[PDB]
Amino acid sequence: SRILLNNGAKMPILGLGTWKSPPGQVTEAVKVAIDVGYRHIDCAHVYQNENEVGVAIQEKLREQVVKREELFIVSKLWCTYHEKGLVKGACQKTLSDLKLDYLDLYLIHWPTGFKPGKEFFPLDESGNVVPSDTNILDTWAAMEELVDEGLVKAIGISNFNHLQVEMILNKPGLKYKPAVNQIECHPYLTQEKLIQYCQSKGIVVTAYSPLGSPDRPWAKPEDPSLLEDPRIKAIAAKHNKTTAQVLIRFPMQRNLVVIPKSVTPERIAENFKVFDFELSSQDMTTLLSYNRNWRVCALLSCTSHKDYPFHEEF
Numbered sequence: 514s515r516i517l518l519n520n521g522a523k524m525p526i527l528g529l530g531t532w533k534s535p536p537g538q539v540t541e542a543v544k545v546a547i548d549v550g551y552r553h554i555d556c557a558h559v560y561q562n563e564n565e566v567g568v569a570i571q572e573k574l575r576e577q578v579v580k581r582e583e584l585f586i587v588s589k590l591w592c593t594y595h596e597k598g599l600v601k602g603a604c605q606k607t608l609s610d611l612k613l614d615y616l617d618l619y620l621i622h623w624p625t626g627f628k629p630g631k632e633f634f635p636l637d638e639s640g641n642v643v644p645s646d647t648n649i650l651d652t653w654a655a656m657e658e659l660v661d662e663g664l665v666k667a668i669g670i671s672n673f674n675h676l677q678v679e680m681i682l683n684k685p686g687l688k689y690k691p692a693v694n695q696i697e698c699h700p701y702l703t704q705e706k707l708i709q710y711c712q713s714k715g716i717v718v719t720a721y722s723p724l725g726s727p728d729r730p731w732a733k734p735e736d737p738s739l740l741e742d743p744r745i746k747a748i749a750a751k752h753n754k755t756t757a758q759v760l761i762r763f764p765m766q767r768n769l770v771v772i773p774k775s776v777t778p779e780r781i782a783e784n785f786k787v788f789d790f791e792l793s794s795q796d797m798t799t800l801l802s803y804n805r806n807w808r809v810c811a812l813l814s815c816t817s818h819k820d821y822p823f824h825e826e827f
């Protein structure tokens with residue numbers, strides 16, 4: 514149920530996602546998740562709901578439903594805090610909101626640094642995001658300081674392409690390697706090349722949007738839909754599981770961590786019931802065959818940023 518990280522800690526392979534979880538529903542979602550066995554919660558400052566996630570975590574700690582050492586809490590440094598002098602304060606704000614004294618894992622959320630300020634997406638008058646000039650290697654050094662100050666047990670990256678991962682790995686004077694690269698991954702975006710690269714370097718990959726993010730704001734009625742793909746439904750039916758359960762089990766069998774999001778109590782519990790069946794190798798290869806390089810998470814406003822990650826093949 515856990516995978517060993519290159520910092521010596523164990524990370525639960527199933528966690529609860531919280532992007533788009535409404536602040537008035539996410540406290541109950543996280544409470545339910547912990548009650549039904551989740552021990553890993555994926556958070557971020559930019560999701561604007563860390564305080565409410567924190568209320569749930571704190572209640573379960575206070576009530577002694579779970580011990581802090583048994584939880585694995587992840588958050589992420591937003592793009593407007595890549596400047597070295599802003600990283601610690603950003604981490605501290607997340608810790609304060611989550612009501613924790615450390616994070617298990619803190620990720621650089623995206624490789625694209627943006628101008629600091631109140632706006633999460635600072636724009637020029639023509640709608641392009643305004644970049645930061647801070648080198649990602651300098652942001653990484655600031656992340657390393659957080660480990661050395663006791664604020665976080667592990668550091669990692671998210672949405673880094675293979676050249677960007679390589680840049681960190683080749684950093685002069687690198688002190689801590691990334692423990693994790695969290696990337697979009699599902700049967701329509703299988704990420705074979707990037708996953709193999711990361712795993713070969715001892716970096717654990719977390720798969721986000723494993724269900725294809727059907728609640729994404731830019732969904733079109735005609736878009737492909739994993740949960741409605743009859744081929745995936747057929748594999749689920751064969752195993753007497755739901756399509757969502759197959760979609761969650763799939764990355765687990767690729768030695769990935771996976772973080773499905775729900776605020777629906779029934780689904781939170783359903784999504785955790787994935788440790789009692791196995792997809793065959795044939796099922797796995799069949800699911801892999803559905804790759805279409807279909808990406809949920811990418812923004813036009815960022816496509817000219819020098820560190821935009823998705824121009825490269827992988």
Ligand SMILES: NC(=O)c1ccc[n+]([C@@H]2O[C@H](COP(=O)([O-])OP(=O)(O)OC[C@H]3O[C@@H](n4cnc5c(N)ncnc54)[C@H](OP(=O)(O)O)[C@@H]3O)[C@@H](O)[C@H]2O)c1
Binds near residue numbers: 532533
């Ligand atoms: N690092 C990054 O840049 C990044 C980017 C995207 C996502 N993430 C992380 O990954 C998490 C997961 O990705 P995601 O939120 O994009 O989407 P997702 O987990 O692929 O899909 C979430 C959607 O699926 C529905 N759902 C969940 N379980 C279901 C089930 N058993 N049956 C039917 N529908 C179900 C949810 O509905 P209800 O909630 O209404 O039940 C919600 O609409 C995020 O929440 C976030 O924590 C990270």
Ligand SMILES: O=C(O)/C=C\c1cccc(-c2cccc([N+](=O)[O-])c2)c1
Binds near residue numbers: 623625813816821
């Ligand atoms: O960030 C998250 O965890 C959640 C969702 C999300 C969805 C679409 C695009 C981006 C996004 C954010 C910053 C930069 C870029 N980019 O460079 O394409 C995309 C993020």
